[PDB]
């Protein structure tokens, strides 16, 4: 019934009267509040000022408050401590670039954005997840790759939309590489074109290029579609917990959230996030952009519980997050009916696909 979530004190003061305060710090509150869509609307409306929220359930799973060290939980999920990469595979990286099929990218966006919404509560939201899984399965069957796996990861008992985890090279030795994007959107009429149809499309193309590649990787590569990112990042919460339980070792994580909108349609700058990411992995991404994508490299900052990468870094995994926009010249249309297909820049997505593939090759073959 009640959600337990972590919010900025800013957001708390807007929710006080409907919430139970469990623990509090100078900047954040750990609360219990039954999220109805009245409260959903408050969360959405205060998000630019007060930041996003983190659903704690994947970290504490129904454990009673009496048994929780609430303050340690609150401190460790609102702070982070920081934790060299070779680039020596130019021939392979260019081979993969030459196989990028921009039309196939665009087609994916057309499909996801044709749904009325992809909400974690709705039937269409469930279809989108099932669709994604089947796109992977089909691709692996089409290129006769047995070397693979795909499964749903339940979004607890709160949301019917599951996450989808896929992997190429299940039997490869070593720490894996993870690529992720979130499949979901808000309720109502939400094409969610830039708000991660884009990210999803980019990684789907990355997967397909990898299947059609002439060389194998020396590590497993995961491609993930997170459920319910628009619900306090709870989908990737469960996914990270699933990786922890299965003891899957992971060397690097890329988050693709909004990979398709340009503020100025011939800007071509790609922005890297500098908080809640690995600085080492981020400098690496910067040099891939300069060396291979030949793009200007910008930097930006994010609010609290910005996106799924946060669940990885909270659990000690190294994380990088390339983004379409800076925090000041934004996508003004995200979370509205106007996050439409026609807002997407295909050159921009192609560049994120390039970045992703260089990432996969230079880590995948060390």
Q: Which residues bind Zn ion (CB under 5 A)?
A: 195-196, 257
Please check if 37 is assigned to a binding site: no
User: Would you say 257 is a known binding-site residue?
Assistant: yes
Cα separation of 66 and 90, whole Å? 56
- Of the candidates 259, 226, 220, the one whose C-alpha atom is nearest the C-alpha of residue 240 is 226
* Contact between 163 and 13 (Cβ < 8 Å): no
Residues 6+ apart with CB under 8 A from 301: 273, 274, 275, 327
Q: Give the span between the Cα atoms of 281 and 271, in whole angstroms.
A: 14
Closest separation in Å from C-beta 177 to Zn ion = 21
Cβ distance to Zn ion smaller for residue 44 or 95: 44
Q: Is 229 annotated as a binding residue?
A: yes
Closest approach, Cβ 156 to Zn ion, in A, equals 20
> What is the DSSP track for 309-333?
HHHHHHTT--EE-EESS-SSS--TT
Query: How far is it, in rounded angstroms, from Cα 36 to Cα 186?
Result: 13
Q: Which is nearer to Zn ion, 1 or 328 (CB)?
A: 328
Q: Is 339 annotated as a binding residue?
A: no
**Cα 355 to Cα 285: distance, rounded to the nearest angstrom:** 8
Give the residue closest to Zn ion by C-beta: 257
Q: Please give the Cα distance from 204 to 208 (Å, whole number).
A: 6
Residue 230 or residue 362: which is nearer to Zn ion going by CB? Answer: 230
To Zn ion, the closest distance from the beta carbon of 319 in angstroms equals 15
Residue 89 in marked binding region: no
Contact status, residue 179 vs residue 223, Cβ threshold 8 Å: yes
Q: How far is the C-alpha of 78 from the C-alpha of 305, rounded, in Å?
A: 9
Comparing CB distances to Zn ion, the nearer of 257 and 362 is 257
- The arrangement of strands across the sheet holding 319-320 comes to 148-155, 159-168, 221-226, 176-182, 250-255, 319-320
Q: How far is the CB of 272 from Zn ion (least distance, A)?
A: 16
Residue 182 marked as a ligand binder? yes
User: Nearer Cβ to Zn ion, position 47 or 145?
Assistant: 47
> What are the residues facing 298 on neighbouring strands?
271
Cβ proximity to Zn ion, 159 vs 292, nearer residue:
159
Q: Measure the CA dihedral 55/59/62/66, to 10°.
A: -110
Give the shortest CB-365-to-Zn ion separation in angstroms.
Answer: 30
> Cβ distance 186 to 117 under 8 Å?
yes
Which tokens hold the place of 49?
Answer: 């000022």
Q: Report in angstroms how near the CB of residue 306 gets to Zn ion at its nearest.
A: 9
**CB-nearer residue toward Zn ion: 294 or 301:** 301
| Min dist. Cβ of residue 53 to Zn ion (A) | 12
Residues tagged in the binding site annotation: 182, 195, 229-230, 257, 335
Residues tagged in the binding site annotation for Zn(2+): 182, 195, 229-230, 257, 335
């Amino acid at each position: 019934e009640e959600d337990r979530i972590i919010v900025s004190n800013c957001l708390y003061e807007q929710l006080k009267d409907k919430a139970r305060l469990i623990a509090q710090s100078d900047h954040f509150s750990f609360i219990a509040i039954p999220i109805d869509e009245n409260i959903t609307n408050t969360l959405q409306k205060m998000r630019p000022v007060c930041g996003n929220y983190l659903n704690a359930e994947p970290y504490i799973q129904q454990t009673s408050n009496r048994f929780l060290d609430s303050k340690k939980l609150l401190d460790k999920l609102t702070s982070y401590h920081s934790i060299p990469y070779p680039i020596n595979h130019e021939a392979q990286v260019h081979s993969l670039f030459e196989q990028i099929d921009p039309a196939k990218i665009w087609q994916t966006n057309q499909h996801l954005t044709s749904y009325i919404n992809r909400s974690a509560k709705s039937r269409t939201g469930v279809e989108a997840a099932q669709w994604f899984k089947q796109q992977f399965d089909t691709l692996a069957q089409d290129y006769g790759r047995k070397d693979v796996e795909s499964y749903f990861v339940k979004t607890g008992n709160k949301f019917i939309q599951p996450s989808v985890v896929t992997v190429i090279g299940k039997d490869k030795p070593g720490e894996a590489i993870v690529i992720g994007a979130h499949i979901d959107t808000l309720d109502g009429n939400m094409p969610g074109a830039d708000d991660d149809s884009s990210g999803i499309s980019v990684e789907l193309e990355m997967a397909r290029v990898v299947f059609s590649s002439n060389f194998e990787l020396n590590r497993p590569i995961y491609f993930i579609a997170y459920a319910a990112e628009e619900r306090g990042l709870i989908g990737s919460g469960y996914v990270v917990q699933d990786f922890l339980q299965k003891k899957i070792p992971v060397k690097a994580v890329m988050q693709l959230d909004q990979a398709g909108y340009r503020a100025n349609a011939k800007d071509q700058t790609i922005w890297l996030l500098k908080d809640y990411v690995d600085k080492g992995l981020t400098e690496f991404t910067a040099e891939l952009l300069t060396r291979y994508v030949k793009t200007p490299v910008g930097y930006t900052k994010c609010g609290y519980a910005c996106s799924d990468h946060v669940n990885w870094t909270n659990e000690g995994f190294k994380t990088t997050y390339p983004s379409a926009t800076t925090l000041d010249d934004d996508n003004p249309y995200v979370h509205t009916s106007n996050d439409t297909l026609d807002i997407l820049n295909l050159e921009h997505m192609v560049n994120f696909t390039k970045l992703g593939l260089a990432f996969i090759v230079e880590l995948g073959l060390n």
